[PDB]
Amino acid sequence: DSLAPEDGSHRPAAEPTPPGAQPTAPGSLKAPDTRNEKLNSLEDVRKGSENYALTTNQGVRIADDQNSLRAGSRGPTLLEDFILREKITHFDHERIPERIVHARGSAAHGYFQPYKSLSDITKADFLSDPNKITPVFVRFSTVQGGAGSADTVRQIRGFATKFYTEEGIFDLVGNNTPIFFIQDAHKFPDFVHAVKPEPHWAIPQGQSAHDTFWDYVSLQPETLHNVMWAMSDRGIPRSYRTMEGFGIHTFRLINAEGKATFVRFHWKPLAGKASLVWDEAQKLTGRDPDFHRRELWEAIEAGDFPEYELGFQLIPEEDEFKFDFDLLDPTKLIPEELVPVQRVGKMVLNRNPDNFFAENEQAAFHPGHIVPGLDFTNDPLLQGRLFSYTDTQISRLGGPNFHEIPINRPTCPYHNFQRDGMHRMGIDTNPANYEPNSINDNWPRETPPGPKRGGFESYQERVEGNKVRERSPSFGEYYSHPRLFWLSQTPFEQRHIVDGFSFELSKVVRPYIRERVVDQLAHIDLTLAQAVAKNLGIELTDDQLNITPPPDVNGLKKDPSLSLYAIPDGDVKGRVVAILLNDEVRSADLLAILKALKAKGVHAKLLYSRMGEVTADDGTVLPIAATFAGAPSLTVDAVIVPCGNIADIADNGDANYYLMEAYKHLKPIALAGDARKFKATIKIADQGEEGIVEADSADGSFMDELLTLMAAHRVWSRIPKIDKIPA
């Protein structure tokens, strides 16, 4: 019974389509021709459904999946109903522990390839040949919230990449800021407990605006640098496609000759850097808590594949101690003005998973999963991470055989003497389960280290010191990097940082904690400190006003690569505009609008006061994607109002509020013909305002203007005009 619509509209077309054009679908059904070695290797466990009989897990066909077995139709359920019990038992045991941190995340499949061979600095196989492609699986995430929390919270974001190389799995488990909050892994449980929901009542969920977080920060000044990044607009990215990625720690690259080079890993977003504004981000956690997850999935379904460039900061071994900060301190960044990022390769995410639980939820990343050609360093945060990931996956994934869960399996050979464990899939035929053995002629065998396909050998770093629980004295500087970050931001970025601290500390109930945090800000920069204090009704003391600013970082008074917006990097492909329809749209305006958006790869969403269709002035039937309230301005990058019967929507509260919200949030707005009467609602300018595109009709020049604004992301010059608007 209950069947598909006659017309076949239940099923999405298996071709690239813009967001909202078709229902989303499992990756293998949406893009069956998109393949890679890892995607193909998962074919053994993919399960179809069309034309198959419904069965139990033991393969018994079910005749009635609507009713339990009972003694009479109004009688008691019987214990012998094994079909009911198997179905309910499986349902009852669907959940597994969420990740302790980074539980909220969104993932996709893709591939990587180097631009040229890097064999002179590393023997890693995946970086040895420009035409050797390596499948990847990437998961982006937030830190604090649970798996069911919201996407556009203010938080550091995780950026984890699993490379399925020919010499083993390499996991590059990074975040979207170049430093971490703490120096030693021993404090991780303390820091995480402080940022997570407070233990008595389990509030608040995915935001750091609460007493315990700011108490920890105020008592542990090493956290200030990453706190500065979190309070900036870096903490509220527009998309996972428009943020940077960093490995944070200094690692080593080892070449065939045995030479070690220190390296820091970077990902550069080829769509550019872009973030939301706080009010927008917070409201969007309510209007669409799945915004980043959705946006990633739809970009891949549209062909707007997330693309990132891998880059390396390289420091010779002999230059380990030449900076004014320790290279092994994860609260310190290496300014690009001192050590440039060398481009290494490109990563493209081009296919969504088939099943979120099987592939995203069960994926296991670990920074200890390195390969020959790579090695660790003594960074005390990284050292502790090496223990933790393996340990947590034993309980999260139910045993030691988590590498046999399909998404986690290597695509290269794996053979050893490990056996058994819960849910053991591999059936070993080796007569031996130990080495050395004579009974299988000692196979599988050890392999000496070498230039290629060699066994792993650690770099023989010299270790000299007593067994101590002590922080290196070189790590005891906490204010210069925060200050370098502060001075590198534009004026509007600085304002947003001030507003971030002010908002968060206004939610701290104990006033002395707010004062202690302001005291720490006074050791970074007095202008920043005074601006936050003023918003909290706090007065800096005379001593606070006389704190000497921290020294410059190796002579730098600023580094523009630390700003999101100082150096233009805008890219409109993949962005989306809202088009507010009316019941008699001028089709000539629409035609020109859609053509210009199409030429730059910008999507459109047609909105109205109701769902269904509206008919343009030439008879074209226009399906409505959503209502004005249903897809708020928060979800788009710009708003366009075509001419037609403007009287239809001129007095619509939601239509007017749509423009007020977009205006407040600094988005470009374009008004054609009679749509220019909406200028009154955003109560500003009569001769026009930079940021507002207006003309008698939507034409080539009107669209060029709008698209130029869109490439600059937001209208920062409108900032002074928005705090009067009631929106």
- Left, alpha or beta for 634 (phi > 0: left; psi -120 to 50: alpha)? alpha
| Binding residue (CB under 8 A) for a copy of itself from 135, 178, 197, 644 | 197
Q: Which is nearer to a copy of itself, 133 or 725 (CB)?
A: 725
User: Which of positions 674-703 make contact with a copy of itself (CB under 8 A)?
Assistant: 681
Q: Is 173 in the site for ligand HEM (CB under 6 A)?
A: yes
Q: Is 725 in the site for a copy of itself (CB under 8 A)?
A: yes
User: Which of positions 580-599 make contact with a copy of itself (CB under 8 A)?
Assistant: none
User: From the CB of 148, what's the least distance to a copy of itself, in Å?
Assistant: 2
Single-letter amino acid, residue 13: A
Helix (H, G, I), strand (E, B) or coil at 701: helix
User: Which of positions 46-105 make contact with a copy of itself (CB under 8 A)?
Assistant: 63-78, 81, 83-85, 87-100, 103-104
Distance between CA atoms of 293 and 151, rounded to whole angstroms?
7
181: β partners: none
Helix (H, G, I), strand (E, B) or coil at 458: coil
Q: Report whether 389 belongs to an annotated binding site.
A: yes
| Binding residue (CB under 6 A) for ligand HEM from 12, 384, 400, 630 | 384
| Binding residue (CB under 6 A) for ligand HEM from 38, 109, 123, 139 | 139
User: From the CB of 171, what's the least distance to ligand HEM, in Å?
Assistant: 8
Q: Which is nearer to a copy of itself, 456 or 503 (CB)?
A: 503
User: From the CB of 477, what's the least distance to ligand HEM, in Å?
Assistant: 19
Sketch the per residue contact string, 327 through 366, with ligand HEM: x for CB under 6 A, - otherwise: ---x--------------------------------xxx-
Distance between CA atoms of 508 and 176, rounded to whole angstroms?
26
158: β partners: 141, 175
CB 615 within 8 A of CB 622: yes
**The two three-digit tokens of residue 388, written as one number:** 């933790």
Q: Which is nearer to ligand HEM, 268 or 676 (CB)?
A: 268
Q: Is 92 in the site for ligand HEM (CB under 6 A)?
A: yes
Q: Is 645 in the site for a copy of itself (CB under 8 A)?
A: no
Per partner kind, with CB cut-offs from 5 to 8 A, the member of a copy of itself, ligand HEM, none near residue 448 is none
Q: Is there a catalytic annotation at residue 57?
A: no
Torsion over CA: 427, 430, 432, 433 (sign): negative
Span interacting with a copy of itself, options 40-48, 131-139, 199-207, 448-456, rule CB under 8 A: 199-207
Q: Which residues contact 512 (CB under 8 A, 6 or more apart)?
A: none
CB 536 within 8 A of CB 520: no
Name the helix (H) or strand (E) containing 108. Answer: strand 105-114
Q: Is 574 in the site for ligand HEM (CB under 6 A)?
A: no
Per partner kind, with CB cut-offs from 5 to 8 A, the member of a copy of itself, ligand HEM, none near residue 173 is ligand HEM
Q: Are strands 341-351 and 105-114 parallel, antiparallel or unpaired?
A: antiparallel
Other Cβ atoms within 10 Å of 472 Cβ, number: 13
| Binding residue (CB under 6 A) for ligand HEM from 39, 42, 83, 101 | 101
**The two three-digit tokens of residue 4, written as one number:** 């598909």
| Binding residue (CB under 8 A) for a copy of itself from 613, 618, 696, 704 | 613
Q: Which is nearer to ligand HEM, 249 or 714 (CB)?
A: 249
Q: Is 102 in the site for ligand HEM (CB under 6 A)?
A: yes
Cα 56 to chain centroid, rounded: 38
Torsion over CA: 545, 547, 553, 555 (sign): positive
Span interacting with ligand HEM, options 383-391, 476-484, 600-608, 639-647, rule CB under 6 A: 383-391
Q: Which is nearer to ligand HEM, 138 or 521 (CB)?
A: 138
Q: Is 554 in the site for a copy of itself (CB under 8 A)?
A: no
Span interacting with a copy of itself, options 115-123, 283-291, 436-444, 560-568, rule CB under 8 A: 283-291
Q: Is 656 in the site for a copy of itself (CB under 8 A)?
A: yes
- Left, alpha or beta for 373 (phi > 0: left; psi -120 to 50: alpha)? left
Q: Whats the size of the chain, residue-wise?
A: 727
Can you list the positions of beta strands (E) in 546-602?
A: 576-580
CA-based end-to-end distance of the chain: 49
Cis peptide before 16 (omega within 30 of 0): no
Name the helix (H) or strand (E) containing 639. Answer: strand 638-641
CB 138 within 8 A of CB 108: yes
CA dihedral 43, 48, 54, 59 (to 10 degrees): -10
Q: Is 381 in the site for ligand HEM (CB under 6 A)?
A: yes
Please pick, among 36, 109, 175, 369, the residue that the annotation labels catalytic. Answer: 175
Q: Which residues contact 8 (CB under 8 A, 6 or more apart)?
A: none
Q: Which is nearer to a copy of itself, 201 or 548 (CB)?
A: 201
Per partner kind, with CB cut-offs from 5 to 8 A, the member of a copy of itself, ligand HEM, none near residue 380 is a copy of itself
**Judged by CB under 6 A, how many residues of this single chain contact ligand HEM?**
31
Distance between CA atoms of 703 and 595, rounded to whole angstroms?
9
Q: Is there a catalytic annotation at residue 102?
A: yes
Residue nearest ligand HEM, Cβ-based: 158
Instruction: Name the residue with tokens 């609008």.
Output: 593
User: From the CB of 590, what's the least distance to a copy of itself, in Å?
Assistant: 18
Which among 60, 82, 61, 78 has a CA at the least distance from the CA of 69? 78
| DSSP classification of residue 185 | G
Active site residues: 102, 175
Site residues (vs ligand HEM, CB under 6 A): 88, 92, 99-102, 105, 139, 141, 158, 160, 173-175, 180, 185, 188, 248-249, 330, 363-365, 381, 384-385, 388-389, 392-393, 396
> Binding site membership for heme: which residues?
389
> Binding site membership: which residues?
389
